[PDB]
Design a binder for this molecule. Structure first.
Ligand SMILES: OC[C@H]1O[C@@](CO)(O[C@H]2O[C@H](CO)[C@@H](O)[C@H](O)[C@H]2O)[C@@H](O)[C@@H]1O
Ligand SMILES: OC[C@H]1O[C@@](CO)(O[C@H]2O[C@H](CO)[C@@H](O)[C@H](O)[C@H]2O)[C@@H](O)[C@@H]1O
Ligand SMILES: OC[C@H]1O[C@@](CO)(O[C@H]2O[C@H](CO)[C@@H](O)[C@H](O)[C@H]2O)[C@@H](O)[C@@H]1O
Ligand SMILES: O=N[O-]
Ligand SMILES: O=N[O-]
Ligand SMILES: O=N[O-]
Ligand SMILES: O=N[O-]
Ligand SMILES: O=N[O-]
Ligand SMILES: O=N[O-]
Ligand SMILES: O=N[O-]
Ligand SMILES: O=N[O-]
Ligand SMILES: O=N[O-]
Ligand SMILES: [Cu+2]
Ligand SMILES: [Cu+2]
Ligand SMILES: [Cu+2]
Ligand SMILES: [Cu+2]
Ligand SMILES: [Cu+2]
Ligand SMILES: [Cu+2]
Lengths: 334, 334, 334
């Protein structure tokens, strides 16, 4: 008996985000999404380390879902028979039934349809949570993503001024726990089930072997660097479903940052580094002022440089010598 | 020569909180509390692991003390002769003498009486701190609690509106360090002194064996689940005296959150997950909208599901299908 | 063609800060600083453990640079031929070229001059970042400091009132990774290069052996305790270039705290413990109310008491019995 218009969304793989309006004149609708779970062995680093991943829609992170406050989000969650485990979905944006987890447990070969009303604005984690010790295991295996619930009037700075982004990227950060054998090489496994005992043992010690963006070391570099132009306002949504992170744009700032990720709160301004609490998403916007390469990292630099947690931006435009200039290039000391 | 009325409080064990007013028409009083230190061997998990605990009033955490801004808090701290170690108390709410620690060092068989003026509003940690390496050891052995200093007009949202809670719970989170023997079983000790060398060695490696609420795995589940009804506004005070935490109510939100815990600051609104800095208390209020079971966790889900850090709420009332509904129950994929 | 007045600054070693104005009637100037890199073996604890340090200006942290919004900061970075490695500098306060890192890479025997416009207010990290895995290694070897960019009208409370400090201290916190040999003693190395392989192995495990202020256990105690008088407002700038911290003044508070460190945001009030995200600086001001000794710690008390992260303040003045009093000294229990 919920008589509103229905709108289908075609999700796109991260770090890109499906097309959407910021401010809208649409009223509430039932926005329809489909997520199909895929368990798969993937490569996570440039050395060829493999990993028993569990994913929504084939990606780590799962895709970003975007709706507006007061929309109803109707998700068909599909667990094909080619998977081995039960799965479900918990939306941190939703109210009741463990975020939906208690209404969405599906065995291989099943699907379920959950609807929730988007009553809270912000960016939020979604993740699998089948019960007990399986909860962390599915999450750290990759079964997490995010959903953005925009105000119908779009974003604002808390001081009456609209904040409109020219583009948005979703960076999902994943702590991974890959065991090593006696001589110190990473182990490979034939199935997630086979990976579980060694993986849980390592998980409980709370030190990841890898911390990656978009599912692999280097995922958001080279051909797949993020991009912008001088003058463009870019929103960067960052999530971490299990473990804290401290994002930083090297050579830039967070002009407007919602580190707790919730648009009912005004953004902070002019940050160097912000903090994503494990189990949350946050967002930062920056207007690029200088061309060139930037790195986007977690600012535990050991994690960034040595465990995988670095993305790049390639930015086009004109250099601004007022903001920064090399007065004297490297030369012998007099 | 401090000539104000005296009021005794009968403390109650966590997660419950002694009776108190939110807004009050009372002026300042001298509010009298007694804390009696107990060292004791306790069971911390469902496997029967034992732990050399050190407690205020027999509990982990120590009980929540509640006063109003401008009250004087007069604590009789008692260290019975049946204990083995010196102890003291540091109130993060207090000004001077290391929070009181420098005025309250008592050997077994002694007591001391400290008064401090409640000039800062919020929730605050209190903990033992006898000196040097004993400081962390006593804290991580359980010797910590919290004190709430309310505004005399009660809580507000920073926008002129009163925030009144229907009930309050105190969740004290404890990082514990229980060593293992060569084959990998947790060790048991005959006294705290005997536990110290192995425990310190483990402590310095900064990875707990257990992270619990209310002193044990499962403490706030089953018979001892937290409770609410749909429509009730519940305040959840969360403390962690030594290590960070990231609280999250699964299936709910933080409607109003003071993550740094201090009522001179407006609350943030509509959070998914908040952050308790080690060495602090914070508070979150939520009005329940849906019946059923909720889990309240730290959202490092490894800690929550595998190391002990999960509580439950059981909530009574009517399900709201507008907020959430299972449109199609699990079924075979077409 | 940048035609502004030039002003030289003589930097001073932490925890002290070079002389500067808070509010100023000066307009923009080119403020000139020199940093000379020194690699050196130092002692980091009272047991005589040694450490292959890499420093700006000989200190850990590097010195605090202080300017005003809209100044241009012109740094001559010098890498003497007596050093072994290339080095550079990344200012989190600066815009473009990886914070300056991409314009300042200098081999031993070279210097470079970088200018950047101080368009963002707050306290910010600066650090070396030569590329790749060298980034974390140089940072955790000591190559980090901070720069404070004040509003030209000085600090304010966000409610229209000026906040003027009577003194400022800079506490730089350093996570250090010193490997151990088979029997468990800390290793010593003949050069940073020789320390690298064992040090990187340890770094990737994300547990420091030492967490210190001002470069060594006990650096800011005894003769070198911080000082104040009752009635003095002290600003404490705290930085951590790689790893989170949770500052706390034992026996005091943070009266006004910018935990994310950026003066475009109002301070929070009345904190017990605040949070410095790794890769940032923050600042807290406190007006002392009581004489005596205070400890300033990270409130992971294991880190504070056992790994090195404790400073002291010695405060002169008159005790205030209204704020705190020992009603009854320790005595036998009746
Ligand atoms: O940015 C959110 C922040 O801004 C304030 C105004 O200071 O409210 C603005 O944003 C609200 C949510 O979008 C709007 O409903 C409101 O009309 C607008 O002024 C704060 O109240 C809020 O915390
Ligand atoms: O919620 C605290 C926050 O609210 C403001 C008003 O925006 O002040 C309110 O709360 C103060 C502390 O309880 C009251 O003294 C004040 O009268 C009331 O308006 C902020 O100033 C404060 O940060
Ligand atoms: O403390 C910064 C905070 O204060 C406000 C007023 O609430 O602005 C003050 O500080 C600004 C930066 O120094 C000044 O430009 C402004 O004039 C002054 O009122 C906030 O806007 C700001 O977030
Ligand atoms: O070689 N086994 O881990
Ligand atoms: O500035 N970042 O390493
Ligand atoms: O290249 N030396 O000035
Ligand atoms: O068996 N000793 O730890
Ligand atoms: O939603 N919590 O795992
Ligand atoms: O039960 N299958 O539709
Ligand atoms: O003794 N070698 O580490
Ligand atoms: O109050 N500090 O340990
Ligand atoms: O010293 N005993 O009261
Ligand atoms: Cu799953
Ligand atoms: Cu969750
Ligand atoms: Cu004690
Ligand atoms: Cu403390
Ligand atoms: Cu360097
Ligand atoms: Cu940096």
């Amino acid at each position: 008996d919920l008589k509103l218009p229905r709108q289908k969304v075609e999700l796109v793989a991260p770090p890109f985000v499906h097309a959407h309006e910021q401010a809208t004149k649409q009223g509430p609708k039932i926005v329809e999404f489909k997520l199909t779970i895929e368990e798969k062995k993937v490569v996570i680093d440039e050395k060829g380390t493999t990993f028993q991943a569990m994913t929504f829609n084939g990606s780590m992170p799962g895709p970003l879902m975007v709706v507006h406050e007061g929309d109803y989000v109707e998700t068909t969650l599909v667990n094909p028979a080619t998977n081995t485990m039960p799965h479900n979905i918990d939306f941190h944006s939703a109210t009741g039934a463990l975020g939906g987890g208690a209404l969405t447990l599906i065995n291989p070969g099943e699907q379920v349809v959950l609807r929730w009303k988007a009553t809270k604005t912000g960016v939020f984690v979604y993740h699998c949570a089948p019960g007990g010790p399986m909860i962390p295991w599915h999450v750290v295996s990759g079964m997490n993503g995010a959903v953005m619930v925009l105000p119908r009037d779009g974003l604002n700075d808390g001081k009456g001024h609209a904040l409109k982004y020219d583009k948005v990227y979703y960076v999902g950060e994943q702590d991974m726990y890959v065991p090593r054998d006696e001589k110190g090489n990473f182990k490979s496994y034939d199935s997630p089930g086979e990976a579980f005992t060694d993986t849980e043992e390592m998980m409980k010690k709370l030190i990841p072997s890898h911390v990656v963006f978009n599912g692999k070391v280097g995922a958001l570099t080279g051909k797949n660097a993020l991009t912008a132009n001088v003058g463009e306002n870019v929103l960067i949504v960052h999530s971490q479903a299990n473990r804290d992170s401290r994002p930083h744009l090297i050579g830039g700032h967070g002009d407007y940052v919602w580190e707790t990720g919730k648009f009912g709160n005004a953004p902070e301004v002019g940050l160097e580094t912000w903090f994503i609490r494990g189990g949350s998403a946050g967002a930062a916007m920056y207007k690029f002022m200088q061309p060139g390469i930037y790195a986007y990292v977690t600012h535990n630099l050991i994690e960034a440089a040595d465990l995988c947690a670095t993305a790049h931006f390639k930015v086009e435009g004109k250099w601004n010598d007022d903001l920064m200039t090399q007065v004297k290039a490297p030369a012998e000391i007099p």
